[PDB]
């Protein structure tokens, strides 16, 4: 149980950090094309999925 619980927490931490890191990476890559173009369409759907 001690070994099992530590493995479960270690798996969750690696998976959650990786999941959020990719999602943060998604927002950076998804939004950057519009950050460098103030005069852009910026569709409303973008503000809902990538933010």
């Amino acid at each position: 149980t001690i070994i099992g619980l530590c493995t479960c927490v270690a798996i969750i931490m690696v998976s959650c950090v990786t999941s959020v890191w990719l999602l943060c990476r998604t927002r950076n890559l998804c939004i950057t094309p519009y950050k460098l173009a103030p005069n852009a369409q910026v569709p409303i759907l973008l503000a809902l999925l990538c933010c």
Binding site: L36, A37, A40, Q41
Partner: protein
């Protein structure tokens, strides 16, 4: 001044531009910007476009370069002369442009900036420029003709 040289070892290793209140410089160029106001800015990385970006001080925002995505066929202006724009590609005569010219801006006949030159292609009689510009929707895109090399 609209364009600011980047100095590494005392020589100019590239140029930084300020467009629409934001300052951009080539990601692959190391050194300080030769401007006391701009040299203190901590910039963010944009690996998509091979450039770093950030805001400028409030005193500079009032006279920054104008963004435009209006790119009809014809000739465009830049530091070393004219730029020809055809088939959605920017080209200049052979021998015009090389190492150290990275980051220079290209402007239309109305004084609006259309692209930031990060590299180019050395062809037999002409050269193609590797630039970051905007598409028909006004969204930033990187233009890299086949064989492009960073300047």
């Amino acid at each position: 001044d609209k364009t600011f040289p980047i100095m590494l070892n005392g020589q100019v290793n590239g140029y930084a531009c300020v467009v629409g209140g934001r300052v951009f410089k080539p990601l692959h160029v190391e050194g300080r910007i030769d401007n006391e106001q701009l040299a203190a800015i901590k910039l963010k990385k944009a690996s998509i476009y091979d450039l770093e970006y950030g805001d400028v001080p409030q005193c500079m925002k009032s006279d920054t370069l104008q963004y435009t995505s209006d790119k009809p066929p014809g000739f465009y202006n830049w530091h070393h002369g004219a730029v020809q724009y055809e088939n959605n590609r920017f080209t200049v005569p052979r021998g015009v442009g090389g190492k150290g010219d990275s980051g220079r801006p290209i402007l239309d006949n109305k004084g609006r900036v259309v692209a930031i030159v990060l590299g180019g292609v050395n062809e037999g009689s002409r050269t193609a420029l590797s630039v970051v510009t905007w598409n028909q929707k006004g969204v930033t895109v990187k233009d890299t003709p086949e064989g492009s090399e960073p300047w």
